[PDB]
């Protein structure tokens, strides 16, 4: 069936960063922290409609023989089902290596890359990613690049089934349990 | 661990060093002739340095707990390693009995 | 990822396909192959260039995206989902939905599987899939397939897919499989009648 | 304070049979008074739900299995509440720590932050496709008693097999019989090289030397040349086959050794076929 | 706590795989011994 | 010679398991 | 004095027992065992072997007779009398719930068991089938001189009360054919013991061919085979091709004697070979 | 009392992952 993705986003500066490092080790699952590093491209084909489809494609460079991974994000259900996440139709798809050749002869040009780098947490169906987005410049090359800003993204995300409540309520809860170190809400795509 | 701990160690005997200091100044105070007034002038110093820094810490250390309070039970745990260094040990210990049953039945073949 | 091979046998020039199926199914039972399961592929093209997505039972969980000669993509089953999601750009083109069923036999690491090409309802023609499980590099046990094929098709033994063609030490895919089969549907719908 | 149910002290116990710093203590005995009751929990319940081939009888904290038709293998749990092989217990107590381990491991985790959840080689199975095969081996919950009753048949198998062998190389004396026992086993598995020369000849008859593969439930033997022969549990088979491989080393040897004294060897039969027949297997003969 | 114990059953597994070995040795020279006795 | 030799052969073993004990006690 | 604590001391072991069963349903039978009845202090009553995959124990005080102590009743079965068994099954002086389960369900096991080898003598007076009880099982030979294995061992999975079978080298289809079909119904063992005949005999013969040259087979579809005596031969036969000197085949043809049900004999043919049509046959002599 | 976060670091970098503010 059509899964949908819950987000809610915040950021952290960097030099208190660790203490929520150790907040997160405590809330989490008992698991060592996981330190992705991703080189993600966004894809776009220029159609007939006013909105061009998007496409994000991953490949995961720290681990060797990690499937590449396709995602299609829908817009935002502007419904007030869940009015505390970001609640989008999310379509996920692990792929081979040749994606962008493919992706190539389908239309598809690219928009942007960027490198992202950080820890990975889980707490039941919730997934913390906490990471630092880097510009790729030289674009060919994943080497070339320069840090975003100073402060790391946190982003705390469950990909679930359509509808499907009590959800962001749990995910309120767990935000709720970082609410001196991160402001984490709802916050829309727009401007 | 040691380092907040023993700063909470510091600031026990300090409240003894406050209470003495107290004690000591209302002692100046009560001699006949106290000829070392600027000895009183420095307990009461003392004291109030004492009570000061005592308030200092104290506040400071509500502030840090403040700062990574949570609420929440730390569902982080060391459990499966101890339960695999157990198991190592007794594997140690079951091939300490068979040596020595094996030697036993060696001393056996050999006392004849 | 074994070697295979992927042919038309030819209508018999009588008879249904049900019955030549029959035939070719009694033959496998004679050489001492079992039953070990049916087996389904299908294969859908998508338009704005070409683009062809096919499914097959041995890979459950995988569809594959065909450019005819540009690359093929692998991927799991929710590539389906992202076909209705595109659904403007990508029109689903019916009237081209091809499929073949039947079963498949297992004779000591060689996997043959006999189907009837059905577009639509009715059936038009049949295909023959042999894979040999061990080898995992094409061109070299080709002779082994040969007589394999020799043995129970007798005439109208193929030989030599253009996949083979390519005369390195490449080693075989299963995108070659359904290249292999993409070319098959593709002779199919223009042999037609 | 401890609960108590968690007091005193428990361990699994497990036997075959041919038959119808204070705190700390505390603290230590009662978690291992949980995770025995855990094992036995999923020992009884997979003893009396999931269907096997020889089922098994559950009374109140005992487990009676017949693996092989004259073995009778005990598991019970022994709660003190203040023959035993050691080795079918640490199994038990690893095999539940890994199946413990299954859920909470690192293989779950999306090292691509887009990629979902779930186990790494499942995810591999999209793009690097897979057969029926290796998909449903990557999903196959074996429970816990089946693992014990295939270590313990294991067990019992490798030792009525050393037991045929040192019985016949008591018994016997007219060839020889040696083996060599290999140094790493599986859970499953084990070897053995089994020679048979002549006592004073170890150099002119080289010419019978076998391989066993003692497996769950069948012994696979590897002749040195190239006669593969899969046996039974029982141990009259290995008694059989290792006698005649004695008789056909009796008439090796003087093949062997005509070679060395320089005479001429007219005919030789491996298996002969002519006179009287004989029960266990062929005879062999030269001239 | 993680660590130490890691190292304590690292240490463990050494030793008993050491002694694994000498004794594998030493079974070899009696099996020869045995086996090849007159009697 | 074949009593020596055994005889040889299980007063090396000893040591050697005597050795090992005194290795194995000392975790 | 007696009335107040001997009924107190009684409904508190109905209550004991209640809890138990909530335990055996909750941990590991689930839904093997379901509670009918339950007035608290009056009576309890469970249901075994139900429909799904009927019978009844209840536990009744009587509202009378203070003198004696908690009432066992068997319902559906009325169970026929075995001295031991039945002994067992009436007494909760121990307060285990899952021994007075086993020890009822045990002894239909047994009678289940016994009509079995009524069926088996029925076919067959002078059978040689044995029941072993430390499990409940029934061990019945399909061949008269053999071993410990090549025995169908049939057991009472005494928590569903279905049949398992159990063969040694038997594939796993036709034991779950045979389990299914016997399980349906006891008289259609008879068909499946004569077909379990000849497939002995097979693995009679390819374990004796083993450490010859030759490759067994039991199709051989060569051409002729309508006016060639080959065609003319029963349907359970053998096809020993020699490897050294292909060519030649000798066919060993298994039939019924008549009058003992339970051995075979053999008839031994040397058919030539060359679309390979036989060339002819002669059978050898029998001693 | 110190500032963990800056709330318009929160804003450009879910605007620089949004979509491409400040990546090209």
């Not at chain 2, 510091?10 to 002692?27: C, H, K, M, S, W």
């Amino acid at each position: 069936i059509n899964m949908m993705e819950y987000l809610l986003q915040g950021s952290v500066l960097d030099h208190s960063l660790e203490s929520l490092i150790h907040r997160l080790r405590g809330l989490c699952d008992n698991m060592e922290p996981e330190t992705f590093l991703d080189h993600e491209m966004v894809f776009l084909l220029k159609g007939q409609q006013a909105s061009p489809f998007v496409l994000r494609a991953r490949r995961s460079m720290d681990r060797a023989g990690a499937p590449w991974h396709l995602r299609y994000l829908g817009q935002p259900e502007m419904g007030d089902k869940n009015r505390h996440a970001l609640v989008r139709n999310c379509v996920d798809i692990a792929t081979s290596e040749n994606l962008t050749d493919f992706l190539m002869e389908m239309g598809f040009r690219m928009d942007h890359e960027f490198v992202a780098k950080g820890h990975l947490f889980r707490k039941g169906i919730m997934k913390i990613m906490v990471y630092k987005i880097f510009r790729i410049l030289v674009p060919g090359n994943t080497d070339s690049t320069e840090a975003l800003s100073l402060s790391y993204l946190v982003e705390l995300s469950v990909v679930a089934p359509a509808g499907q409540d009590m959800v962001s309520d749990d995910m309120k809860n767990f935000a709720e349990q970082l609410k001196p170190l991160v402001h984490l809400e709802k916050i829309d795509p727009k401007r | 661990l040691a380092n907040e701990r023993l700063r909470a160690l510091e600031d026990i005997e300090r409240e003894i060093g406050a209470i003495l200091q107290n004690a000591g100044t209302v002692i100046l105070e009560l001699s006949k002739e106290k000829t070392n007034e600027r000895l009183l002038d420095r307990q009461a110093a003392a004291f109030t340095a004492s009570v000061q820094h005592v308030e200092a810490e104290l506040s400071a250390q509500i502030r840090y707990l403040t700062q990574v309070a949570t609420g929440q039970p730390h569902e982080g745990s060391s459990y499966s390693s101890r339960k695999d260094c157990q198991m190592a040990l007794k594997r140690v210990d079951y091939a300490r009995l068979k040596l020595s049953d094996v030697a036993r039945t060696c001393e056996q073949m050999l006392e004849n | 990822m074994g070697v295979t091979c992927v042919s038309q046998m030819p209508v018999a020039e009588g008879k249904s396909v049900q019955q030549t199926v029959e035939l070719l199914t009694r033959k496998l039972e004679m050489l001492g192959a079992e039953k070990q399961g049916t087996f389904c592929v299908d294969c859908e093209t998508y338009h704005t260039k070409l683009m062809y997505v096919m499914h097959n039972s041995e890979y459950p969980l995988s569809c594959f995206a065909l450019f005819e000669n540009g690359p093929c993509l692998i991927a799991d089953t929710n590539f389906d989902v992202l076909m209705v999601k595109l659904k403007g750009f990508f029109q689903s083109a019916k009237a081209s939905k091809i499929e073949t069923r039947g079963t498949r036999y297992q004779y000591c690491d060689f996997l043959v599987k006999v189907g009837t090409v059905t577009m639509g309802p009715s059936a038009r023609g049949i295909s023959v899939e042999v894979e040999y499980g061990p080898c995992v590099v094409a061109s070299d046990c080709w002779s082994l397939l040969l007589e394999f094929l020799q043995s129970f098709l007798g005439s109208h033994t193929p030989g030599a897919p253009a996949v083979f063609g390519n005369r390195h030490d490449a080693v075989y895919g299963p995108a070659d499989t359904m290249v292999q089969y993409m070319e098959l549907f593709n002779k199919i719908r223009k042999q037609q009648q | 304070q401890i609960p108590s149910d968690l007091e005193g002290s428990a361990y699994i116990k497990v036997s075959i049979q041919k038959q119808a710093p204070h705190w700390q203590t505390k603290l230590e005995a009662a978690q291992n008074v949980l995770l025995c009751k855990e094992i036995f929990a999923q020992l009884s319940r997979e003893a009396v739900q999931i269907k096997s081939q020889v089922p098994h009888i559950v009374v109140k904290n005992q487990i009676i299995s017949q693996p092989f038709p004259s073995l009778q293998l005990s598991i019970s749990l022994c709660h003190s509440s203040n023959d035993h092989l050691y080795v079918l217990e640490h199994n038990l107590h690893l095999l539940i720590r890994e199946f413990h381990k299954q859920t909470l491991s690192s293989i779950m985790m999306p090292h691509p932050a887009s990629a979902p959840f779930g186990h790494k080689r499942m995810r591999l199975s999209g793009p690097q496709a897979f057969d029926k095969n290796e998909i449903n081996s990557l999903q196959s919950s074996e429970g816990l008693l089946e693992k014990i009753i295939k270590q313990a048949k294991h067990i019992f198998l490798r030792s009525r097999a050393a037991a045929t062998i040192d019985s016949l190389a008591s018994r016997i004396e007219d060839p020889q019989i040696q083996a060599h026992w290999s140094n790493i086993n599986d859970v499953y598995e084990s070897s053995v090289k089994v020679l048979i020369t002549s006592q004073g000849y170890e150099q002119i008859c080289k010419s019978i030397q076998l391989q066993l593969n003692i497996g769950v439930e069948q012994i696979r033997v590897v002749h040195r040349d190239g006669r593969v022969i899969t046996l039974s549990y029982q141990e009259q088979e290995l008694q059989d086959f290792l006698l005649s491989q004695m008789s056909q080393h009796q008439v090796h040897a003087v093949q062997q050794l005509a070679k060395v004294m320089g005479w001429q060897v007219l005919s030789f039969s491996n298996h002969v076929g002519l006179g009287p027949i004989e029960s266990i297997g062929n005879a062999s003969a030269i001239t | 706590r993680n660590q130490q114990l890691r190292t304590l059953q690292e240490e463990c597994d050494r030793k008993l795989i050491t002694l694994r070995d000498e004794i594998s040795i030493d079974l070899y020279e009696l099996e020869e011994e045995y086996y090849s006795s007159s009697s | 010679n074949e009593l020596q030799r055994k005889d040889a052969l299980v007063q090396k073993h000893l040591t050697k398991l005597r050795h090992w004990q005194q290795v194995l006690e000392d975790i | 004095m007696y009335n107040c604590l001997h009924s107190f001391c009684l409904s508190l072991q109905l209550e004991v027992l209640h809890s138990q069963t909530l335990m055996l349903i909750r941990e590991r039978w689930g839904d093997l065992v379901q509670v009918e009845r339950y007035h608290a202090g009056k009576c309890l009553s469970l249901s075994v072997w139900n429909q799904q995959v009927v019978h009844k124990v209840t536990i009744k005080i009587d509202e009378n007779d203070v003198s004696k102590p908690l009432q066992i009743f068997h319902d559906p079965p009325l169970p026929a009398s075995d001295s031991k068994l039945v002994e067992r099954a009436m007494k909760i002086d121990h307060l285990s719930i899952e021994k007075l389960l086993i020890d009822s369900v045990h002894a239909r096991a047994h009678q289940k068991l016994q009509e079995l080898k009524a069926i088996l003598r029925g076919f067959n007076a002078n059978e040689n089938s044995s029941i072993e009880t430390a499990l409940p099982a029934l061990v019945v030979p399909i061949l008269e001189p053999c071993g410990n294995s090549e025995c169908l061992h049939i057991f009472v999975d005494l928590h569903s009360g279905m049949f398992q079978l159990m063969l040694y080298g038997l594939d796993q289809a036709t034991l779950d054919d045979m389990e299914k079909s016997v399980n349906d119904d006891m008289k259609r063992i008879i068909p499946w013991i004569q077909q379990l005949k000849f497939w002995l005999g097979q693995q009679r013969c390819k374990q004796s061919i083993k450490h010859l040259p030759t490759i067994s087979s039991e199709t051989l579809q060569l051409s002729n085979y309508s006016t060639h005596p080959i065609g003319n031969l029963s349907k359970n036969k053998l096809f020993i091709k020699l490897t050294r000197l292909p060519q030649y085949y000798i066919v060993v043809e298994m039939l019924e004697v008549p009058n003992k049900p339970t051995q075979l004999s053999y008839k031994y043919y040397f058919m030539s070979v060359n679309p390979a049509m036989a060339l002819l046959l002669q059978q050898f002599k029998e001693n | 009392n110190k500032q963990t976060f800056n709330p318009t670091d929160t804003n450009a970098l879910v605007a620089a992952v949004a979509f491409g503010k400040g990546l090209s």
